[PDB]
Amino acid sequence: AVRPRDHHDYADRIALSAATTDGVQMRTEDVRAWIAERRDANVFHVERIPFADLDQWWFEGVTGNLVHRSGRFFTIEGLHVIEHDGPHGDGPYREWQQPVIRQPEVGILGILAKEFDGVLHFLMQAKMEPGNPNLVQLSPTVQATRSNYTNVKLIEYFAPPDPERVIVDVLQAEQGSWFFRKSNRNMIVETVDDVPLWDDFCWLTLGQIAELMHEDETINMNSRSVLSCLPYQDITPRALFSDVQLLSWFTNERSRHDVRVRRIPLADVCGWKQGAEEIEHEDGRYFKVLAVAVKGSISWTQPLVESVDLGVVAFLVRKIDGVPHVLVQARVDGGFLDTVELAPTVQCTPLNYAHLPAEEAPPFLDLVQNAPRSRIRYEAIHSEEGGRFLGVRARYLVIDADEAIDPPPGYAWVTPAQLTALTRHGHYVNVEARTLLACINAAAAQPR
Template identity: 35%
Template sequence: MCGLASRSVAAPSHLIKSRADQSLLDEIRRWREGMVRTRYARPSRLPLDAVPGWNTGVAEPAFTHGSGRFFAVRGHSVRTEDGRRAWMQPMVDQPEIGLLAIAVTPSDRGYAALVQAKAEPGNINGIQLSPTVQATRSNRERVHGGRPVPYLDLFDPATADVIVDSRQSEHGGVFWQKRNRVMIVRTPRFEPDVGFRWIELADLLALLHDDDLVHADTRAVLGCAPWTLPSGFAAAGARIPILPRTLSGAARCDVRPLARWLSAERARQSSVSVSVALPDLAGWGRSADALRRDDGTGFEVVAVSVDAAGREVDTWCQPMVRPVGLGVVGLAVCDRGGQLNLLMQACPEPGLVDDVELGPTVQIAGGEAPRSGAEADLLALLLDRPMEAVLFDAVLSDEGGRFLHSRCRHLVVLVDDCDAPVGFRWCPVSEVIAMLVHSHQVNMQARSALVCLVGAVAGEPLSRSEPVPRPAARTAA
């Protein structure tokens, strides 16, 4: 793991000791709404060839920042090594390793997380509950000439009380080999700056049920946490009482069979990518305001000017990726021999460092179609299950720094036991959590779905005995 050659990672007993306090959730929502008046990042669309500070002209081989830092948008030609698929697309090239980090402090109810009310230009609702630190190297080094990133000192690996420290991927369908250092550190409680607050982890997970409220990077970090639950979560109306027992096995389970299966899938589904100039992307066309696919599917690259408050700088311009539809992240769960299992897929994405990582049962980017007949069938299975089998159903945003209004419907659904299709595997949830100790094994969408699974339990009040009412059915895409 990153930065821990001579240090052991301290594992807390339980991050959550009781379910969410429903009386606090409205107060947290009001706090976020109050922040909207003084913290914002409002985007305005720009013509694609008129982005101050950027090289985005029609003849440019790539969209690059004048400083040579931050990120670029480059063209890629991708083909699978077996020759079955080939395509071209733009990708966000951000070689810097970002830092996604959350500070937690012990409390009577387990642990509380230090979150920030952060405004990003791509957020659908202005402000979301974001990690303590969410910054690229350029931002940490203040290449933008603006204010410093708060609380960086809490995550010095030489002095921090580290719970999680690993390197993880970002969306490999759009980002080219983007890596983030993911950290969770334990710290004494202190009075936070304006725009930050401590939120109990149980309450934060309960707020996952609110559309577009808990930031994608918060979910990505918490997905790496060593989740265990007290035995009391198996009683008093819990909808999946075997979850605490299954989680307890994460520290001692043998992940070698799963790792070997994933290695074989990487060999079977590997791909090759070469750089292509943006004007030469086959199947893509450029208009005055966007670079988009000729058939109108998937995503497009646009440009925005941002007016901001409560950020390191007050104005800037940048390209952004805008999906043309709503995506789906779906997770099928099942009781197999008294263990809660997740149906995971070996999910290939062209931008991943190692081609394939463990993904959720269904992973469909906005504007895209299912990547296989098996995934289409599994999507239909999840959507057709009765309401009482739906553990979680909310629309959650992707990060808003590079994505403009990118959202995925997140579903966690109990299903009957069935055979896993080729490229899929039933995994005890403890195995998936154990794999997250290592880098680049479980993708960002799967980490988000895993947190939604834990939130489906931790977000229930202790006294509830009837199923949680689900939102009205939404279209899948």
């Protein structure tokens, strides 16, 4: 039995859910209380601890890599990157070494969807992670690397998914500054079954999620990544680049740099000092590796990575003949698999550039940091994955560009719909850009 190649398009159902803020389970204004109710339901204290007091983690002796004795979860290893300016690369030349998080197994980031009263809802999970600054945020229905579990609720809907019910299934990369070539499987799958409901789960329409997306530190990094992959229909199907032209532009960005990376032992990393409490850069930039104990009120100890300052991640937006475009950058990070990924107009931790002249600041940073309320279309503070990162936060913005811009090398005007289409594939849209696409789609569905 063959079917049409575009069989079972969910675009109309997705649209109806995004337009609806009346959900079956909970009023949107009550979710904040529900989260607090879940946070209070078992108190966790996360305390920073010397590395020596890590329980089942150690620095293994030959490599000095920070590893869990069972061989599960992740490792902290070393990375050496060179970008050449020579031939076969445009440069400029860059070279550095750093600690890096490694985790070779693809994990599942799965959102279960089901219709109630004729409107799709999505089963969000109130999930405690040790590095969440507010402890509990809303994660996907299933957020798990399977072999980290000797028992994950609802995992069977994603392992394998029913192929008749897949809305989204794609691998997408995570932060290329701090993880070495990490991607997880982003999935949205429908069911008609009665689904068991545990206290930590709430069915929400996409319109309820769109409102919640404007709130700080509420919808977690993994939820924003998976929701960014939703295949909306394009309402304005024109763009400055045709889709082939955009693929060609990006092909040239991925071909024009000469980046060589190698994984090295953590003990070999130059420029970083390993103390009794932290591994930190010698000039206090970038991030630190630290250790925490997690106690309930169940317990464990683990490394986490913390950044040195609040980050700034922004898209500049311009309407071109009436069609909104965002200015992407084809960014070259050390942990990327295929040299480049598209990223927001500005993506940086500003302190990392404070030592350099104003003209080596990230392009457009000044413009974003000093923008008027009137040009700010979206602003919120979101944090990164709390299983690996301790309180790593950034101001995520969408700002109208007050005047035309000639994009500098490495930048291009692309529509959000073109970004939505590329999320069918991996290594095109980076995690920060995926978060801002989820924010743009939320602002469109439920504006404030």
